[PDB]
Design an enzyme around this catalytic site. Structure first.
Site, short mmCIF file in Angstrom:
data_model
loop_
_atom_site.label_atom_id
_atom_site.label_comp_id
_atom_site.label_asym_id
_atom_site.label_seq_id
_atom_site.Cartn_x
_atom_site.Cartn_y
_atom_site.Cartn_z
N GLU A 47 31.11 35.54 45.41
CA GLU A 47 32.19 36.33 45.98
C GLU A 47 31.76 36.99 47.29
OE1 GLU A 47 33.94 39.40 43.51
OE2 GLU A 47 35.38 39.96 45.06
N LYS A 95 34.79 32.69 45.14
CA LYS A 95 35.83 33.71 45.03
C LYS A 95 35.94 34.39 46.39
CE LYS A 95 37.40 37.73 42.42
NZ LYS A 95 37.17 38.66 41.26
O1 LIG Z 1 36.72 42.09 43.27
C1 LIG Z 1 35.71 42.28 42.61
C2 LIG Z 1 35.65 43.43 41.62
O2 LIG Z 1 36.90 44.11 41.61
C3 LIG Z 1 34.53 44.40 42.01
O3 LIG Z 1 34.35 45.39 40.98
P1 LIG Z 1 33.49 46.68 41.31
O4 LIG Z 1 34.17 47.49 42.41
O5 LIG Z 1 33.35 47.54 40.07
O6 LIG Z 1 32.12 46.27 41.78
#
Ligand SMILES: O=C[C@H](O)COP(=O)(O)O
Ligand SMILES: O=C[C@H](O)COP(=O)(O)O
Ligand SMILES: O=C[C@H](O)COP(=O)(O)O
Ligand SMILES: O=C[C@H](O)COP(=O)(O)O
Lengths: 349, 349, 349, 349
Positions: B188, B230
């Site tokens: 990602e 992603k």
């Molecule tokens: O898009 C990826 C996730 O929403 C990231 O989650 P996080 O902010 O807890 O790292």
């Protein structure tokens, strides 16, 4: 546009002043940062049980050596020792300060295989490093150390591109994080002596690795004025029957540095990497007969400063004085070697 | 010589089979891996106290939705949830297995500023990652996720070379470590929408970032057949008054992927990055009217699958059915969008 | 900020339309761009004196073959031929146009050793290239070709990093210059078959080289939509006693492409690199039984289209018809192979 | 494995001896390699018609200056001049040899826009370079020069990554080719003063460019011991109303070099890039009050050595002596500046 934001002048000045203090003429670093496990090997060499009390006794033996600060500018500690007290109850850092030796701290978390390499190693430790650096600075550390490892194996293409890329990346990130927390980073890309390769092969590999390391330091905005390098000397592989002459090791080592290391770096503090106490001193001495150099060439020795000290201690307390005596003999030898004035003991393009 | 050792055929086959299962036609990923703090924001939107019991209730509400597996191939979990039980005492992973949804696990440790950048972020988490991957696989996870973040700021030169280099390095290391532990890595590299830049600027930056990411994946011996991407869709910046048309977003997004992503990758599972539930569905649908494509184009949505589910739950228990109903409506919309068959709800070189 | 200025939409559209015309289904390229010296070897195989009249006769024999345009979309010419007339006085380009075959022009200036490598080659020709491209476009050329060469030698570490870096740099510069002058660049990084390495070694090296090539194309702002790739197939080395099966060559070749080539590229036009006429056809045919693919897989053959044509001509004029007959047999075979419909003549991660 | 083959010791020794002769204490280079067109501008400044006879007269005026070799170690020539005779019939190279001045030759073929950049320049000339170097060595040249150009424009992101990559690649290829033909390469990456940027911006850009240049020199197996650098000094942009002090220019210039240039390089021979004759001398002098340095800091000046010589010549023959007198005044000034002993005429991290 997208260039490095300017480092703080106040932080930069501290880093540069401390790096130059560590690379002081006639002095070098005592590497006493053996992990809890690595020290077991040492204590086993003389039959000592690796108790916290024995480690505290031995590190106290080292750091309470009277007059050690004449030849030792800094001491690299393992985390345990940074927060340890001597058997008599004095903090280890206070022993160092009393000799005017700057405390330093090993901050990497050891080695892990890079997936799908032939046992080539990444150095771990960036997670939480910045916060660790802050606590270590408050505890009295003013420089850090991070060890990366490469090996030479012509048949396997070692060190591979991935190994070199990883080593350089880890060292550059670690160095920039240290400097953001007011710690002078010692950049240690150790090329192991394993193998039967010639000294000229070690020279070629050392050049390629250092060129990559220093490009990455630049990419990550590392201040060379406030950093130190801890490289291998350039030598034959450890499986070679005849060791290269001291003049040969000195020539190829200085050449490899001058071909890759920008002279804003204040100091190159060599690792001894398995050399005998006397070879480590003579090889450094020979480099400093070739001076003056664009940077200080000095030492950051563990085994080469402690081997005889351990065998004289033998875990027996009462001969603490004898052990400290031999540590002073080796500290003096290497301090004199830094000046090219050690009297012995015991151009190719 | 110094090339990547061959990946295990048995491990490679598992990774490729699971990656293709995750990228299954008509299905996509539910991103429910909000950290303990990120979920507080969500619960605050509807006035719910972030107790472990409430988080367990909500994740149970999501994963126990009957028939969810028709549209959801996998669910990304936060570590807490992977080892959590529903209020009724059923392990969260067993809820997923009962629907045939593959469990996945977020494995990065969040973001830290790169020293001497203007608040550009490294993603941390490599230390201990390999051992974490082993435990997570034993707990039932079969894929992982690691989020890196870049931002666009033409005046500041963002994303800088250091930002891109760091993002690519972290993603490649993480991906190779996952695959060595039998977890499919979701890669990602999120380019944030912050700013008032045009969609064509987002396209240029997305291309540069993905070119760098995929070169680094290759350098680190990552098996594309057993990986997933992603990325952000390609859109105007969030400060732009008019949002790009769905046809424009679809065109530039597909173009940016086809210019940089080798077709051995089985699936591109988009993040929704602040888009409305309906935009996220319509934008994906528009891309899959342009099919067939060399890889599956699908979704890995958090907010775009949960926004209305939360506002329908309101923290009130009894309307659990209503909330699950709206989750199904959005899961169906996006599953149909994967096929280019969503009916709406609510060449440039 | 410092991104590539946008390519002209009008120029981009021309390049993309012509690249897709060259990569047309059921058709491929006739490589007839043998330099004045390389053709001497060919004429020697059948005992013909390399006079300008004989070269003109032979190229006329090729290009005046009635119906050749059913299977041949483009013909790569040497500069001499681009400005040559047939023995009957018709310009060679007019022969091509009458069959609807697009003329192409070799634009590199051959190979030169990289200093201090073991006979690894740079491709020369960037000086004056842009001005040459303009003149060649006015003379009727619509695509270009630039050949780089790498070799595999595990003991010597070939291809070295410098070889790969140089090849990629030259190809990217050449490709961007061509596109600025309205010529579709054929990007030819040929990995030679020399040696006794396995097909899996060829696959690893091909992947590394193509990953580097396509990263450099991106760095230099090359429009993949208006470019073509001319790679080696993935095969055993030429010193191997047993040739890999056609199914094996097809599998590893397609895999190496799908792991490295973004699908915006319209066409991969293989070189035959010493293969027999029938192997070249069967290997391509086997790849296109594995279709449909994200790009056209086709041919850009010299020897594999001309070998029997030459031996049937024998330099004897009157059997011009026989020679043209066998050229048509091979053009048809390879056109059918492009579709996976050739009937013969004469997953591993 | 795949490392650089060893350079010939005999060739390496010649290159290193000649590079050190060129970088001799108290001496520097006269840049008289103005192309046929660039010299027209100069002759226009004083109203002289650019005839071959006038160019021969002027270059004879320069090189026949008695005692010039006390301050000038080498003279860069344009190809015409290398093979030219003075009006009196003496070969230009023989004039140089009589003063013990080493002849050098410009070998690049000028600049061409990189496609899809905002007028950023590649340097052309690699084609045939190796063969040219051989002929030039036979004609008496012992060093070469290749000029690359970068510009600073923060709003446009200049210099872009592609510009820096191209400059470094061209310089490294050229340098390795020169050394294979026994010519010392002068590596000239000139960052233009165009713009209103601060001196600190010039310093950041100079550091990034030199770091890239020297990494590429290493990658291409260039022997630093037998090479020279010809960089811009670090200064304010030319649109700045106030010029930086000589102390500021000296500080930032030395700092940028020490941060990037390995000390195996024997000499840094600055270009004057539009500075006045007196500024060029004073800025160099100020750097050499900061000595001793790890490399020779000296001059390779065209305009800064010739400006007043031209205005004193005025194309009028009889005042040849006056013109030679002022050339000696400037040669002496800059030779003394090399030593930090010029008496005038006319730490930040
Ligand atoms: O898009 C990826 C996730 O929403 C990231 O989650 P996080 O902010 O807890 O790292
Ligand atoms: O040379 C560096 C240190 O000896 C490394 O210590 P370590 O093995 O505990 O990491
Ligand atoms: O495969 C490409 C061409 O056959 C190369 O022709 P050439 O040897 O004349 O450069
Ligand atoms: O500074 C280098 C030379 O003045 C460049 O000469 P040139 O403009 O003829 O290439």
């Amino acid at each position: 546009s997208g260039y490095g934001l300017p480092i703080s002048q106040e932080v930069a000045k501290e880093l540069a002043e401390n790096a130059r203090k560590i690379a002081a003429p006639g002095k070098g670093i005592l590497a006493a940062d053996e992990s809890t496990g690595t020290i077991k090997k040492r204590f086993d060499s003389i039959g000592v049980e690796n108790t916290e009390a024995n480690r505290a006794f031995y590190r106290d033996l080292l750091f309470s050596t009277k007059g050690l600060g004449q030849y030792i500018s800094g001491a690299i500690l393992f985390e345990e020792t940074l927060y340890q007290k001597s058997p008599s109850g004095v903090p280890m850092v206070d022993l160092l300060k009393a000799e005017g030796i700057i405390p330093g701290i090993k901050v990497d978390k050891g080695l892990e295989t890079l997936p799908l390499t032939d046992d080539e190693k990444a150095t771990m430790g960036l997670d939480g490093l910045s916060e660790r650096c802050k606590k270590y600075y408050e505890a009295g550390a003013r420089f850090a150390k991070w060890r990366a490892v490469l090996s030479i194996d012509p048949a396997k293409g070692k060190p591979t591109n991935l190994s070199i890329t990883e080593v350089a990346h880890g060292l550059a990130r670690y160095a920039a994080i240290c400097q953001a927390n007011r710690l002078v980073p010692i950049v240690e890309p150790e090329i192991l002596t394993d193998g039967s390769h010639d000294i000229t092969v070690c020279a070629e590999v050392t050049e390629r690795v250092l060129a990559a390391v220093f490009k990455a330091l630049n990419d990550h905005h590392v201040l060379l004025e406030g950093a130190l390098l801890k490289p291998n000397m350039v030598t034959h592989g450890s499986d070679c029957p005849k060791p290269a002459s001291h003049e040969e090791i000195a020539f190829y080592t200085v050449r490899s540095l001058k071909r890759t290391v920008p002279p804003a770096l204040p100091g190159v503090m060599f690792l001894s990497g398995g050399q005998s106490e006397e070879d480590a001193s003579l090889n450094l001495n020979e480099m400093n007969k070739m001076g003056p150099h664009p940077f200080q060439l000095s030492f950051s020795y563990g085994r080469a400063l402690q081997a005889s000290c351990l065998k004289a201690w033998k875990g027996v307390p009462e001969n603490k004085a004898k052990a400290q005596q031999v540590l002073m003999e080796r500290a003096r030898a290497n301090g004199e070697a830094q000046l090219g004035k050690y009297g012995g003991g015991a151009y190719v393009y």
